[PDB]
Every structure is written in C-alpha cells, then in structure tokens.
Point group: D4
Chain length 180, copies 8
C-alpha cells in the first residue's frame, strides 16, 4: 500500500494505541494498511477513551474499549453481576463506578447532533450514558451530564483539534472528513 | 501433578502475588502443586488485601498479610505499642491508621453470613474489624462500616466475579466451589 | 569558547532542560557556547515554566514553552479553536484550563515592575495573564491573581535564589546581572 | 571491626539512606564501622526526616537534612531570602512551606521531655519548630502543633518501634539505648 | 473455550513469543483459543528459530520467521537483491550470512525422516537449507551440514524434550502428538 | 510542510538517529521538514556508519559522524596526536584502531564508481580510507580493502535495499533517486 | 533468632542468591534463621555454581542447581534423553555441553582430598565429573580435568577467600569452620 | 569555592567516577572543591583504570582502585592467598589473572620516563607491573610488556588527549600541568 495516512497514524499516536487499534481491526476483519481512515479513527477513539478514564479520580472508570471482545465482555458481566445493572446489548467503552453506568464514547466528523442520534438509536437501552466528541470542538452528553470536569474535557477537544491540524497540514484531512 | 488449576492460577494472578502465595503455603506446610484450590484461594485473598489497601488515602493502611509470620507479627507489636490497641490473638490482614483498628479480610464461596459468623467466632476479640467479600458479589462488614468507598469495594467485587468466570470457562469453578 | 558559565549551566540544570534550551537558541540563531548568559536565562525560564505547570492540579496547564515553534503554535490554535479564546499575537508559555487564559512567564534581573511593563506593552492583547518572577524573590501577576498556591510560588523563588547563589559563588552573577 | 550493628544497619535501612548517613558521618569525622550506634542513629533520624516530608501535600516540605552542609545551607539562605524568615543559627532538618517555619526533628532514646529541652536550649531562636519522636512511641512538638496528620505520625512511630524490636531481637538494643 | 493447553502455552513460553504466535495465527485465520495444539506448535517453532539465530556469531543470521508476511518478504527481496540468491517460492525462517543460504526450520512429532521428505518436496528449490528437529531428540539437516555447533543444537533438543515432559506431566502430550 | 517523506523517515529510522540527523542538518542550516530527501539521506548515512562501527571487534572503531562539529574535530586531534596520523582536511566518519586510518563512508544512489571518484577528489589526502555503499547492493573500497567481514557488509546492503523498497512502496523512491 | 551470621549472609551475597538459598533450605525443611552456617554454605555453593557457568563460552553449561527439585530433575531427563548420558542417581549442579558430562560442585572447609572422597563415594556412577573448591584456595577435579580456564577458577578462589576474611573479621569464621 | 575546574570535572567525567573520586579524596582528607587539580587527576586516573580493565578478555582483571581501602586490601589478600603472589607494600590498581601480577597505573603530566622512575622507586618490590600513560600520548610499561592490545591502549591515549584539549579550551590546562 504505502499510504501517507498509515505512516502519519504511526507517527501521531502512541505505539501501545497503534498496536491496540491494529489488533482491534484485524479481529473484525479490517486491514489498517488498506483502510487507513478507519485506522486513524480507531486510534483517535482509543486515545479519547484513555484520556477519559484518566479524568477524575483513580479507579473511577473501568476501561472496556481496547480489550479483546471475549475479555471485554467478561468484565461487563462482572460489573453487571456486581452492581445489578442491565447487560448492554452492544459493547460499551467504559463503566463509571461513581455514577454506576456504562459510557459509550463517540468521535464524529459531522455535527455532534447527528452522531448522538445514530448512537442513541442503536443503543435502545437508554441506561448506557452517551458522550460524543467532535474534531472541531463540540461535545454532547446524555441529560447534559458530561461526567468529567470541564478541564479534562477541554484537554480532549484540544488534542482532537491538533489531530485535525496535523492531518490537514499533510493534505489528508479532507479524505478523513469525507470518510465517515 | 500437572493440574489445570495450577496453570490457571499462574496465568490469572500477578507474579508477585503467586510468589507470595507460594511462600505462604510452603511456610505452613502446603503444596501449591497438589492442593491447587487453596493455591487459588490464597492468591485471591492476597489480591483482595492489596486492592483494599490501595483504596482510600496513601499510607492509610498497614499491610500485614503477605509478610512472613515473624515479621508480620513484628509490625503488629509496633502498631499496638504505638497506638495502644490490644494485641490480636490471630494474625490479621491490615491495620487502619484512619479508624485505628485491624481488619480481617475474608473471601468466601458460600453466603457472606456464614463466613462472617465463623470469622467472628475465632476472633473472640471484638476489636478487630471484619470485612467479608463473596465471589457472587456481596459483602458484610462489622457494624455495617465498610471502611472504603463504594467505588473501591465495587472494583474488588468485579474482579472477584471475573475470577469465577475464568474458572467456570475452564470447567474448574465447581471444584473450587465445593472446595471450601 | 570554554566559558565557566556554560559548564555551570550544564551542571546546574537538568539535562532535558539544557537540551530544550539548546534546541531553542539554535532555532532562533543563538549560540549557547558563545552567549552563555542567554543560555542560563533560557534554562532558568524553562525550569520556572515546568515547575509552574507542576503546581496545582494534574492536566491543569498546557505547556507551550519548550516545544518547537510550529508545534507550539499548533497547540495554541487547538486551544483557541476549542475554548473560543482570542489567538495571541506572540507565543505564550502556558495555558490555564482552570482559568481559561494563557500565561506569559517572566524571570527578571531588575525589579519586577519594569519587566512587567515591557511585557504588558508587547502583549497589547490584555487577555494573556502575566506572571513575573525575580531572582531576589519578588513576583508580580496580573490583577494580583497569582494563579498557583503560595507554597508552589515559594518553591520557585527559593530555586531562583539558589541559582543566584550558585552563580555568585563562582563569580559569574555580576556578568549575568548586567546581561539583561 | 566486624560489628553486628553495622551489618544490621545495612540490612535494616534503605541503601540510599545508608549512603547518605555514611557521607554525613565521614564529613563530620565519624567512622560508621567503629561508632555503629551513631551510624544507626543517623540512619534512623534520616529515615524519619524522609517520611516526615512524605507526609502531607507534595512540595509542602523542603528537605534540608541529607544534603552536604554547604548546599544544605545554600537552600536555607534561599528560603530565608524568599520568605523573610530569620536565618537559623544551627542547621535545621526541613522547612514547611505551608506553615512558613523550619522544623528540627529529633529521635530520642529517653523520654521526649528531656530531648526537647536540650533541643530548645541550643535553638535559642524560638522560631524553628521542634518535633521529637521516641522509639517507645511518644512525640512532643512545639505549641502542641504536630504539623502532620495523625496517620502520618503514627506510621513513623510504628517504624521506630520495629527498629527497636529488630535490634533487641539481635541483642543490640541495650547497647544502642545506653549509647545516647 | 478454556483449554488446559492454552493456559499451558502461556505459562510455558515467553510472552513475546506467545504474542508473535498469536499474531501469526490470526493473520492466517487461526484461533489460538480453539486450535491450541497449533498454538503450541507455533510457539515451539518460533522459540526454536530464535535459539537457532542465537547460536553462532552475532549478526550471522537474519530472522525471517516472526515478522508479518509483507515485511518478512521485504527482507527476503533485500537479501536476494544483495547476495544474488534465488528468491524462494515459500517463506523461509532464517538466512545465513556465513553460508549464504536460507534455512527452513522444522519441529516434528514423528521421525525426522518423514518431515524432511515433506519439507524437501514442497521446497522444490534445493537451494534452501533444511534443518529438522524432533521432540524426542533427533535432527536431520541437508547434506549432513547442521550449520551450528553441537552445543547450540544440543540446547535446542534439551528444551524440546522439556516441553514434551511438561505436556505429558499435564496429560496433554498425547493430544499434541496425534495432532500432527 | 506535511511531506510523506518526513513521516516515513520518522517511522523508518531509530529515534536517536532521527534526532542526530535533525541536529546535524539544523547545525548546517538545513530544514528536515522542507528538504526531506536530505533528511532521509542523513539518517541513512548515519545508520550505515553505526552498523559499520558495530562490525568487527569492540572498541575497534571511533565514531566521528554524529557528534557536533567542534567535538567531532576534538576527537580527530586526539587520534592524530596519539597515533601520529596526518590531520584530515575534511571531517571523516570513523577511525580504525586496527588499521590505523580514518574511514569516509558514502551511500550513493548512482553507480559506486562515480561517487568514489567525487569522494577521492575532495579527499586529496589519500591516507583516509574510502568505503562506498549503494542502495542496489554494491560497494567499492580503497585498495579493495573492505575492512569488515563479508557478513557485516552484507547486513548493511540488505538494510539499504529494504529502505529503497519501503520508499518505492510509498511512491517516494523516484524523488529520492533523482535527488542526488 | 537475631544471629550475626544471618545478617552477614544477607549483606554479603546477592539478593537473588539469598532468595534461592532460602527457597532451597525451606524446601528441604531447613531454617535459614536458625541454622545460619548452612545458610552461608548454601549461598556460597550457589554463587560458586553461578560463576562456574559464567566461565567459558555462552550456553556452554546448563544450570541445574538453584532450580526447584522437580524442574531441576526435568532438565536432567531432557539432557539425558537428548545426549544419551546415563541418569545420575543424585541431583548434580551443572551440565557441560562441551564435554558432555554433568558436574558436581563442592565447597569444603577441610582439605579438598577428604571432601572429594566423600563426594565420589556417594556418586558411585563415575560418569559425573567432580570439581571441589576450598576456602583457603585449593581445587581438585576428576582426572585433573578442571574444565574451565585458570583465570575463571582463580576468580572463584579469590571470592572464596574474601568470604572467609569477611567472616573472620566479624569473628564468625571459627563457628563456620567447625560447622562442616 | 566556585572553581571552573570543579564544574568541568563534573561535566567531563561520568557521575559514578566523580562519586568514587570524591569518596577517595575525602577518605584521605582531601577536598575536591578546594584542590580541584587533584580532583581532576583522581577522576582521570580512575577512568584510565576502568578502561584498562575493560580491555582484553572478560574477568581478566580484578579492579582494586576505586574500592575503599579496607575492602581494596581484602581483595589483595584473597588474590595473594589464592595465587601465591607476594603481598604488595602499597595498594596497587588492578590484578592480571592472565599474567598473574598486579598492575600499578600512572597518568603523568611530564615525560613518562620520570614518572615511572618515581613509581619504581616506591615500589621496591619489582613484582608489581607498572604501566604509565601520558596526556600527550606516550606510554611506558615494565619490560616493554604493555599487557593489552595496541587498540585498547590507543583508546586510552585518545581520551587522555581529549581531556587536555577540553581543559586548554577553558584555559585550565596550564594550572593542571604545573600542578603535578
Ligand atoms: C492497564 C494496561 C493498559 C491499559 C491502557 C491505559 C494506557 C494509559 C497509559 C498511561 C500510564 N499513560 C499516560 C501517559 C503516557 C502513558 O503511558 N494511557 C492513558 C492516556 C493514554 C495512555 O496510553 N492504561 C490505563 C490504566 C493504566 C494504563 O496503562 N489498558 C488497555 C485496555 C484496558 C486497559 O486498562 N492493560 C490492561 C490489561 C492489558 C494491558 O495492557
Ligand atoms: C511494598 C512491597 C510489596 C507490597 C505489595 C503491594 C503490591 C502492590 C503493587 C502496586 C505498585 N501495583 C498496583 C498496580 C500493579 C502494581 O504493581 N499491589 C496493589 C494491587 C496489586 C499489587 O500488586 N504494594 C503495596 C505498597 C507498594 C507495593 O508494592 N507488600 C507485600 C506485603 C507487604 C507489602 O507492603 N514489599 C514490602 C516488603 C516486601 C515487599 O516486597
Ligand atoms: C511531556 C514531555 C516533556 C515535558 C517536560 C516536563 C518535564 C517535567 C518532568 C517531570 C516528570 N519531573 C519532575 C521531577 C523530575 C522530572 O523528571 N519537569 C517538571 C519539573 C522539571 C521537569 O523536568 N513534563 C511535564 C509533563 C511530564 C513531563 O515530562 N514537556 C516538554 C515541553 C512540552 C512538555 O510537555 N514531552 C512532551 C512532548 C515532547 C516531550 O519530551
Ligand atoms: C531528591 C533526591 C533524594 C531525596 C531523598 C528522598 C528519598 C525518598 C525516596 C522516595 C521516592 N521513596 C519512597 C518509597 C521508596 C522510595 O524510594 N524517600 C522518602 C521515604 C524514604 C525515602 O527513601 N526523596 C524526597 C524527594 C524524592 C526523593 O527521592 N533527597 C535527599 C536529601 C535531599 C532530597 O531531597 N535528591 C535530591 C538531590 C540529591 C538527591 O539524591
Ligand atoms: C529484534 C526484535 C525481536 C526479535 C526477537 C528475538 C528475541 C530474542 C530476545 C533475546 C534478547 N533474549 C534471549 C534471552 C531472553 C531474551 O529476551 N530471543 C532469542 C531467544 C528467545 C528470545 O526471546 N531477538 C533477536 C534479536 C534481538 C531480539 O530481541 N525479532 C522478532 C522477529 C524478528 C526479530 O528480529 N524485533 C525486530 C523488529 C520487531 C521486534 O520486536
Ligand atoms: C555512545 C552514545 C551514542 C552513540 C551511537 C551508537 C548507537 C548504537 C546503539 C546500540 C546500543 N544499538 C544497537 C541495537 C539498537 C541500539 O540501540 N547503534 C548501532 C546500530 C544502530 C544504533 O543505534 N552507539 C555506539 C556505541 C554505543 C552506542 O550507543 N554515538 C553517537 C555518535 C557518537 C557515538 O558514539 N553517545 C556518545 C556521546 C553522545 C551519545 O549519545
Ligand atoms: C536465568 C534465571 C536466573 C539464573 C541465575 C543466574 C544468575 C547470574 C546473573 C548474571 C546476569 N549476573 C552476573 C553479574 C550480576 C548478575 O546479575 N549470575 C551469575 C554470577 C552471579 C549471578 O547472579 N543466571 C545465569 C543465566 C542468566 C542468569 O540470570 N538461574 C537460576 C537457576 C537456574 C538459572 O539459570 N532464571 C532461570 C529460570 C528462573 C530464573 O530466575
Ligand atoms: C562493579 C561495580 C562498579 C565497578 C566500576 C566499573 C565501571 C564500568 C561501567 C561499565 C558498565 N560501563 C562502560 C560503558 C559505560 C558504563 O557504565 N566502567 C568501565 C569504563 C568506564 C566505566 O564506568 N565496572 C567494571 C565491572 C562492571 C562495572 O560497572 N567497580 C568500581 C570499583 C570496583 C569495581 O569493580 N561495583 C563493584 C562493587 C561496588 C560497585 O559499584
Ligand atoms: C469494529 C470495532 C472495533 C473495536 C472498537 N469497538 C467499538 O465499539 C467502537 N468502534 C468505533 C470505530 C472507531 C471502530 N468506528 C466508529 O467510527 O464508530 C462507529 C462504530 C461503532 C461501533 C462499532 C463499530 C463502529 N467507534 C466507537 O465509538 C466504538 O465504540 C474495531 C474495528 N471495527
Ligand atoms: C494458612 C495461612 C496462610 C497465610 C494467610 N494467612 C491468613 O490469616 C488467611 N488465610 C486465608 C486462606 C486463603 C489461607 N484460607 C481461607 O480461605 O480462609 C480461612 C483461613 C483463615 C486463617 C488461616 C487459615 C485459613 N484466608 C484469610 O482470610 C486469611 O486471613 C497460607 C496458607 N495456610
Ligand atoms: C528567543 C526565544 C527562545 C524560545 C523562548 N520563547 C519565549 O517566548 C521566551 N523567551 C525568553 C528568553 C529567556 C529567551 N529571553 C528573556 O529573557 O525574555 C525576553 C524575551 C521574550 C520573548 C522572546 C525573546 C526574549 N523569556 C521568556 O519569557 C519567553 O516567553 C529562545 C531564544 N531566543
Ligand atoms: C553530626 C551531624 C551529622 C549530620 C546530621 N545533622 C543534624 O543536625 C542532626 N544530627 C543528628 C544525629 C543523628 C547525628 N545525632 C543525634 O542523635 O542528635 C543530636 C545532634 C544534633 C545535631 C547535631 C549533632 C547531633 N540528629 C539530629 O536530629 C540532627 O538534626 C552527622 C554526624 N554528626
Ligand atoms: C552537511 C553535513 C552534515 C553532517 C554529516 N557530515 C558529513 O561529512 C557527510 N554528510 C553526508 C550527507 C548525507 C549530509 N550528504 C551526502 O549525501 O554526501 C555528500 C556530502 C559529503 C560531505 C558533506 C556534505 C555532503 N554524507 C556523508 O557521507 C558525509 O560524510 C549534515 C548536513 N549537511
Ligand atoms: C539440601 C539440599 C539443598 C539444595 C542444594 N542441592 C545440593 O545437591 C548441594 N547442596 C550442598 C549444601 C550447601 C546444601 N550442603 C553441603 O555443604 O554439601 C553437602 C551436601 C551435598 C548434597 C546434598 C546436601 C548436602 N552442597 C552441594 O554441593 C550440593 O550439590 C539445600 C539444603 N539442603
Ligand atoms: Mn467501543
Ligand atoms: Mn465508542
Ligand atoms: Mn491473613
Ligand atoms: Mn483474611
Ligand atoms: Mn515563551
Ligand atoms: Mn516567558
Ligand atoms: Mn539535622
Ligand atoms: Mn534533627
Ligand atoms: Mn519452519
Ligand atoms: Mn561524515
Ligand atoms: Mn560519509
Ligand atoms: Mn547441588
Ligand atoms: Mn554441589
Ligand atoms: Mn595508579
């Protein structure tokens, strides 16, 4: 292949995040060397999930995203069978021990209103909290409850905009924008 | 021997916890390669003790479990001769500098009501606080005082249920359940 | 060259700070081996910026100083396009996520009143917060808002005075004082 | 020499503490291999000073003990010339940025009342705060202001009593007790 | 699944070897949790390849096995376009810079005579050197040229027999033997 | 800028080599973000120099390339004033303690015959040994004395061809080829 | 207990050697805190075995001493079933891949002639090579074949005499001498 | 003090060498901050001793210089009581296990002929081998036996001349030259 986006993803993101994104796509039958926009999206969504759990108190969140599917589910059963929360239909991203709810994290390239709508439709179980992030710098969360501090959310939006600038500086943003 | 449970314990728990459990059983004349259910129980009880001390503030707890008996006692004398607390008859697991009491941690495979009863009977000295944990996800603590935050206790129950799932997934839970 | 001040700067400051100061001066066409007083000033200003961000909460500050100009700007655009703050004319040193403002850090060898005046004149955009530090041990901040705790600011002034003592002990302070 | 106390000190205390105590005694013309009770006392006093600064908030204390005399003084001048505190006649152990005072730490083998008296007599400058610790488990601080939390002070007394037990277990406590 | 062989493979082999074997099987559409005998065979073949390159001089061998297919081929082209050796039809395991030939490593569960025959049939290009190893402790190499020292080959056979003993001790060898 | 070649250089070469190449170009007034082909050439020439010194015995070579000019010269004077070798007019790359001569390493994109000619013309002092390497896989050394083993030189040519394949796979080789 | 010899053993020998000796004695029902002379002898014999394998070429020796009995035997079976050597009746210390024989290492406090005699009597199988070392500085090996270089054996005797001096300097050698 | 030479010594030599030289001078009642030329000479002599032992085979040399006097002697007794070599009157620097002799290393600022003469006069025991090194680049060894390879000795002279250049570049060589 030899795509500019693949080499940018490896230079932009942390090696442990690239490896986890590579393992995730291959597990679902995706090629990071061919479909490089999904490779960039998976790394971005992964890093956002990690910074999110880094916000707030220690051991406040349980990280579901990034684990292989079987083990990622195994933790979901344990959290449900411990706290008494309904089992989600689809795999979520985190669990909040402080608010006792799962969190589905989204990173969109359009307006946050559309992405949340498509997310809340698939998640017919209204118990899982939703928190969308946008590259331009918006965010929409369920019941206007954004969970973390303003400063922790601000760090995420700042990094999101840096990625967009880095892509556009290499003339790869427009392909990534029209990808979603 | 070559038991499935021994290889699972080594793959499931952290190497430092396995070594401490191995040293503990051998010191009391127990074979981790033969009696593998007690090997799994000692690792589980050890990890629960470590997460427990990881809850709350730093240097809030003094870890007694995991040390060799002579040194584990030596610290008990120092804590007693410093705070003026009665010397426990049997070796406890932790000491709470915030609540000024020793803690005996239990991890049971039956209902928490029975295990606490047997624990409180041996500990005729009602000064040592008792905190039981169950694999299914319950907990019973003395005077309904559970010491740590709800989130820290929730992390322990979640990990406890993951261990049960991992055992049952390998068809070793029933032997571990009827072991106690 | 073989200047006493160059070898003192390398012995006084942390290697990562010396490398960042070396990279900064060379990027702006400055020689650390020739103009060693500016070499000492850049290291001092860098270390003060790092301790400043180390004060307060984690992820409270975004460190702009120390990055290469293109990337240092890139983060400024992201912070502006995320929080809605006006773009500064000149490169600042940090950004406060808690107070939503950029910070320009100064380390002067004269009275803090003059240095602040020259700083506020160049920064015609009154939105960027200014915080001056002096070697003797004073500080002047915009609107008397010194941002960090008294203890964190005290640590900075103490280190500043240690550097002056170390220079004067080697008979290099007077050259550094009349340098500015 | 080949003293039991020297090998106990090396086995009991952390290597960085032993090296700092060795460097301290040699600087003052003392032999750790000959006068092993002073070797044990210097290590104990050093470790108590380190745990003390580990109590409370980060960067709350400035550690004076453990540095070589010239640099230990250099920091004292900087703290005085920054906060406006009188220069102590004798070298103190720490400085409290929160309470704006120097701390002299003592570890005695008799009752804390005597040791404090001898300490307050030498320190005719009543500005430096005094905090005595005893092996048996007492403490006396100036104006009954013990600075740190009860839990942090309790950790120090517990460790102090463990050292006494370790010495007595090797029949070296009586020599250490009649040493002071 | 929860197979005894999967947990044995993770406990028996080095983590970097397990990860490389996991990545290899998934790339070829194989499940290490389901087909655990091939999981053990891939780890064994990988470790044998690594010890083989560890024999002899440094930089004597170029390791082809363990790399992802595209990069593993890329190195083959470079070695061919540098030394002038014919391009192998199938991916080999190593390249010998000292003897200027590729090496195909085999680890069989039957007699080495059969495995070599099947290997030499697929490798119709007689230029690639073949070196078979057996669990019981035999070896067959092309033209009786075993490349490495007797001591380095002996270390490989010893480790091979230890793996067989470890499997048989857990009653998993017969399934692994009848697997091939 | 945002060039594909810059991100490839950072992904292809080791971080310490990229930093040394960056420092080298900036010192000579070159921009690695603009003139990315020279950025790739400097990294390649650096890595070839490092592998070259890695060949043969330990401490056989003194690495001149990679150091800043003033210190790189300083070592040249020491080697000359120690062994009695004439001072080279231009900065060489290594020094051979075994053959008592400096080595100038070249990595060309045309035939090795031309590059050596231009190299030997500038180096009018015929004492400095010359060793050219080509991407396609040739090498020309002074007096047919190639210094290192055949296997060590083969490793260099193999890596050289891998870089060419990686560039061509990303459609950046032709620009790099017509660069020289 | 609190013995001078126990604290000397911990200060004299490497932590990994002390842990292996502790695990060895406990496995055979021995107390390192009570029988401290056997604790010193096991550490000494262990360190001698490790330096012995460090002599000569890499991977020349297979270390049997230091492993737990079951695994130490497992390797013996593999070495026998690979090289065709008779199975030793008692556990040896090393295996020589170069000379194809097991080695029994001895460290005596009397003359090497007696210790070898008692060793060769128990080892009725004359195939296992014997190599005795003495604290004073002698050595006796089977068939006058001392296996390693003179320099490697000299390093062992030098360290052996340093241990004797360290013990005698603490007035513990005579108890260790009359122990055997 | 604040001497240019002290800060140069700390910047020129490795931290472990500076610490060992500091400990050596203080042990003999010397101040590295006052007598900085002896501080530079001790570091230089130490580094030369370390490179010397780094020459040749592994474990060929026993390093005596750098240890504290009591332990440095202890090893000398062990080497003598093991190999049967006469005890040196003064402390040597190394011991050669290959040539069975102690080595006294010298680093002079005058001609090597004088320094060797003064060295051989004090060492009336003609058994200890002598090897002098000069800053300008000469060497004189007993019986013209220079022990190590030409390349290893050349590395030492090259580093020696680099130190002289670094001193002269800072106008501190003349003081160091007239120091001896
Ligand atoms: C726990 C471990 C990996 C974690 C992944 C995640 C990464 C974390 C690393 C931290 C440290 N920082 C921050 C600064 C640089 C760095 O390095 N962050 C957060 C920000 C970006 C990043 O990288 N975290 C969080 C806990 C500790 C840790 O490392 N993951 C992976 C998915 C599940 C999980 O918990 N696990 C768990 C088992 C397998 C494995 O590998
Ligand atoms: C102190 C030391 C060992 C401690 C054991 C315990 C382990 C701790 C490790 C932490 C870090 N985490 C967390 C993430 C992974 C990791 O690694 N946790 C807690 C969770 C599971 C775990 O593993 N703790 C607690 C203090 C620091 C430390 O390490 N122990 C052993 C018994 C007594 C004791 O205090 N000691 C003390 C002397 C001997 C020794 O070894
Ligand atoms: C993040 C990383 C480097 C950081 C520089 C800065 C240094 C920090 C180091 C800390 C740890 N301490 C404190 C004790 C000793 C030590 O080591 N401190 C603070 C005090 C002095 C010091 O040294 N910080 C802050 C975050 C973590 C870190 O390391 N920088 C450089 C400019 C931008 C930036 O964030 N980055 C970012 C990308 C390139 C790079 O290198
Ligand atoms: C700063 C550095 C050394 C510090 C000494 C002190 C030691 C500290 C180590 C911590 C980490 N813990 C705790 C767990 C094990 C461990 O390791 N603790 C505290 C408890 C016992 C201990 O050991 N601290 C405190 C700051 C970080 C650090 O390391 N010192 C020495 C005197 C001055 C000083 O600040 N410095 C400063 C310059 C020279 C040097 O070496
Ligand atoms: C180079 C690197 C990984 C290597 C894999 C291989 C592993 C090697 C590790 C050595 C060290 N030992 C030995 C003792 C324990 C240990 O750790 N051994 C050999 C014995 C078992 C083992 O584990 N080697 C060999 C060179 C250095 C290295 O690590 N590989 C993977 C396939 C290609 C390759 O060269 N690479 C290369 C790029 C990706 C990556 O990861
Ligand atoms: C010495 C040090 C840096 C060296 C650079 C060079 C790098 C070497 C690293 C080795 C280890 N390998 C090999 C496997 C991965 C790795 O990491 N190799 C060789 C192959 C590629 C590579 O990276 N070498 C050689 C000696 C040890 C060392 O590291 N340099 C830089 C120029 C001068 C010099 O000697 N120095 C010296 C002072 C400043 C500095 O940084
Ligand atoms: C392999 C590993 C442990 C080894 C023990 C042995 C220790 C070795 C350490 C070396 C490095 N040096 C030398 C300088 C300081 C140091 O650290 N030396 C030799 C001299 C003293 C010493 O300490 N060796 C030898 C191979 C690498 C290694 O570490 N052992 C323990 C018994 C079996 C074995 O092979 N293993 C194997 C599985 C369990 C484990 O732990
Ligand atoms: C053994 C240990 C310290 C040694 C000192 C000496 C230092 C050695 C370090 C090597 C690695 N290199 C080389 C590259 C950078 C580096 O780091 N070199 C040699 C060149 C300069 C240098 O620094 N050596 C030699 C053996 C391993 C070691 O480290 N010493 C101190 C005196 C006695 C002794 O043997 N010891 C022993 C007990 C106390 C202690 O600390
Ligand atoms: C698939 C699943 C994965 C593992 C990630 N698992 C997810 O559930 C997940 N994956 C996404 C991504 C970034 C993938 N695609 C994306 O842009 O969002 C749409 C989506 C949502 C859920 C599954 C697949 C795609 N984003 C989420 O927010 C998200 O929760 C990897 C590749 N394909
Ligand atoms: C014995 C003691 C040990 C050291 C652990 N010391 C304990 O006191 C302890 N050990 C347990 C375990 C898990 C062992 N067995 C168990 O399941 O609990 C029953 C028990 C309680 C106390 C001693 C022995 C068993 N559990 C506790 O809660 C506990 O406090 C190891 C092996 N045999
Ligand atoms: C230039 C810019 C740099 C990078 C640093 N960037 C800065 O903006 C900056 N640089 C300074 C320094 C210490 C440099 N000189 C100084 O003493 O202050 C005057 C100053 C201010 C801004 C730019 C240049 C000099 N100090 C600041 O406070 C400061 O914010 C390096 C060399 N020359
Ligand atoms: C001297 C000074 C040192 C450096 C330590 N500096 C001190 O000031 C200091 N040293 C002590 C010690 C434990 C030494 N002796 C002791 O037991 O206390 C009496 C004392 C007090 C001050 C100086 C010397 C001794 N204890 C303190 O509390 C203390 O503050 C080392 C050796 N001799
Ligand atoms: C200049 C010097 C440097 C430092 C490198 N110093 C060199 O002497 C050097 N630099 C080269 C490079 C790869 C640069 N250019 C190149 O392709 O070779 C031509 C060359 C030779 C010498 C100086 C400059 C260019 N190659 C050599 O072989 C070589 O020895 C960096 C940038 N510009
Ligand atoms: C037992 C076995 C061990 C494990 C060590 N295994 C040995 O085989 C062994 N153990 C020795 C020691 C030093 C123990 N005792 C000793 O001094 O030698 C006599 C001896 C020999 C064999 C077994 C036990 C003692 N020495 C050897 O040379 C030796 O090979 C530990 C404790 N008791
Ligand atoms: Mn997800
Ligand atoms: Mn998501
Ligand atoms: Mn317990
Ligand atoms: Mn318990
Ligand atoms: Mn700035
Ligand atoms: Mn500034
Ligand atoms: Mn003090
Ligand atoms: Mn004190
Ligand atoms: Mn193969
Ligand atoms: Mn060059
Ligand atoms: Mn070159
Ligand atoms: Mn043995
Ligand atoms: Mn033995
Ligand atoms: Mn000397």
């Amino acid at each position: 292949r030899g795509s500019h986006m693949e080499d940018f993803v490896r230079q932009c993101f942390n090696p442990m995040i690239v490896e986890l994104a590579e393992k995730a796509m291959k597990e679902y039958g995706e090629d990071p060397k061919i479909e490089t926009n999904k490779f960039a999206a998976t790394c971005t969504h992964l890093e956002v999930c990690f910074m999110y759990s880094d916000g707030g108190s220690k051991h406040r969140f349980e990280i579901i995203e990034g684990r292989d599917r079987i083990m990622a589910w195994t933790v979901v059963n344990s959290i449900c069978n411990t706290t008494g929360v309904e089992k989600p239909k689809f795999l979520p991203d985190l669990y909040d021990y402080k608010e006792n709810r799962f969190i589905e994290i989204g990173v969109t390239r359009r307006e946050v209103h559309i992405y949340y709508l498509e997310k809340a439709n698939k998640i017919k179980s209204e118990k899982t909290h939703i928190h969308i992030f946008s590259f331009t710098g918006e965010e929409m969360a369920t019941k206007a409850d954004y969970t973390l501090d303003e400063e922790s959310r601000a760090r995420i939006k700042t990094r999101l905009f840096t990625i967009r600038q880095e892509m556009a500086s290499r003339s790869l943003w427009d392909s990534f924008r029209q990808s979603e």
